[PDB]
Amino acid sequence: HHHHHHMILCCGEALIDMLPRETTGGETAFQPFAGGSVFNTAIALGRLGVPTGFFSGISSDFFGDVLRDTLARSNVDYSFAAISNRPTTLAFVRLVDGQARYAFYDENTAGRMLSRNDMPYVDETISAMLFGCISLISEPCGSVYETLLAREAPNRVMFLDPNIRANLITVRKTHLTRMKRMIALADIVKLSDEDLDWFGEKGSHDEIAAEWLKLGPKLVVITKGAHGAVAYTNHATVPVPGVKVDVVDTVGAGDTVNAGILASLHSQGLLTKDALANLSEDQIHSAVALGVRAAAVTVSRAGANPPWAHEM
């Protein structure tokens, strides 16, 4: 086993986004792009210069090759991932009558059919783990990821990004109970206002954050689009304004906020459970502001294309 040098290990989906493009012959085709929210977060972390790892199910096929190539060039260690001959998850996007239509091809895929046997070896040189998004909806991988979070939560820092995609949730009740169990096990929870709306809880979003801070998390961050983010602890509330940019699109911007927060806490030497329980206003602001600043670069260009440290 290799020393992972105080690594942040991202655990979750890697997929191919299949997006509509125009061919030379004036016909619609689908151009493949490496993607998946947790994948994007891992890419963003690597580009910020943090020691970064990725655990997922990845195919041996040519789409799997795309994913691995992208991870490698962003310096992400994906030795943790389970490789199999199952196909790669494909996410088709179309514009139909000025409205977005989605088709999710995830049958018996490398990513979906993870088993307990596939769980990574995690020693003291992993400082933190991140979970989130659609890898937690699907089965059997969702149960594997929840099990991994529950197994490792006592040992190191846990970050959860609910990142709700309701169109893929077939039974609300069952995903909601999983979210609550996983929030209870998280040290840091980051989500958008829209994410939070899906939980259907009472009161202002500030009030709900305060309630969640009684359930396990030491830090709750609510992202607010162009408006930045607000961070909540039991000792402080820290509003962080957005950065003004010329917007191309905002897809995957939240994935970069995850990276900025974790990268800053890493740099500050605050990635321990105990350190997180004692964050100062300055330490919180620094971490969420890096997430917000980094995410602003992403929204300034097409797709989830997170910033290199040297781009900032």
Give me the residues that bind Mg ion (CB under 5 A), please.
Answer: 225
> Toward ligand ANP, which CB reaches closer, 126 or 297?
297
Minimum CB–partner distance for residue 35 and a copy of itself (Å)? 15
| Residue 251 touches which member of ligand ANP, Mg ion, a copy of itself, none, C-beta under 5-8 Å by kind | ligand ANP
Amino acid letter for position 189: V
Instruction: Give the number of C-alpha atoms closer than 13 A to the C-alpha of residue 281, restricted to the C-beta side.
Output: 6
DSSP state, 77?
Answer: B
> Toward a copy of itself, which CB reaches closer, 72 or 103?
103
Instruction: State the maximum Cα–Cα separation within the chain, in Å, rounded to a whole number.
Output: 60
| Residue 226 touches which member of a copy of itself, ligand ANP, Mg ion, none, C-beta under 5-8 Å by kind | ligand ANP
Residues that bind a copy of itself (CB under 8 A): 18, 21-25, 27-32, 61-63, 86-87, 90, 92, 94, 101, 103, 105, 107-109
Q: For residues 126-138, b (16+ Cβ closer than 10 Å) or e, as one string?
A: bbbbbbbbbbbbb
CA distance 224 to 231: 11
Q: Are 68 and 78 in contact (CB under 8 A)?
A: yes
CA 166 from centroid of its chain's CA atoms = 16
Residue 144 neighbours by CB under 8 Å, 6+ apart: 114, 115, 116, 118, 119
Judged by CB under 6 A, does residue 245 bind ligand ANP?
yes
| Residue 229 touches which member of Mg ion, ligand ANP, a copy of itself, none, C-beta under 5-8 Å by kind | ligand ANP
> Toward a copy of itself, which CB reaches closer, 108 or 117?
108
Minimum CB–partner distance for residue 307 and ligand ANP (Å)? 12
Minimum CB–partner distance for residue 136 and ligand ANP (Å)? 14
CA distance 23 to 25: 5
Minimum CB–partner distance for residue 131 and ligand ANP (Å)? 15
| Residue 32 touches which member of ligand ANP, Mg ion, a copy of itself, none, C-beta under 5-8 Å by kind | a copy of itself
Cis peptide before 32 (omega within 30 of 0): no
- Considering only 110, 231, 276, 299, the residue that binds ligand ANP (CB under 6 A) is 299
Q: Are 112 and 87 in contact (CB under 8 A)?
A: no
| Residue 163 touches which member of a copy of itself, Mg ion, ligand ANP, none, C-beta under 5-8 Å by kind | ligand ANP
Q: Name the strand (E) or helix (H) holding 234.
A: none
Minimum CB–partner distance for residue 31 and a copy of itself (Å)? 4
> Which of 130, 47, 13, 15 has the alpha carbon at shortest distance from 297?
47
CA distance 9 to 142: 17
> Toward a copy of itself, which CB reaches closer, 58 or 90?
90
15 phi and psi angles, rounded to 5 deg = -150, 175
Judged by CB under 6 A, does residue 192 bind ligand ANP?
yes
> Toward ligand ANP, which CB reaches closer, 32 or 225?
225
Q: Please identify, among the stretches 47-55, 111-119, 211-219, 290-298, the one whose residues bind ligand ANP according to the rule CB under 6 A.
A: 290-298
Place of tokens 């995957």: 252
Question: Which residues sit at the interface with ligand ANP, rule CB under 6 A?
Answer: 163, 192, 194, 223-226, 228-229, 242-243, 245, 247, 250-255, 257, 292, 295-296, 299
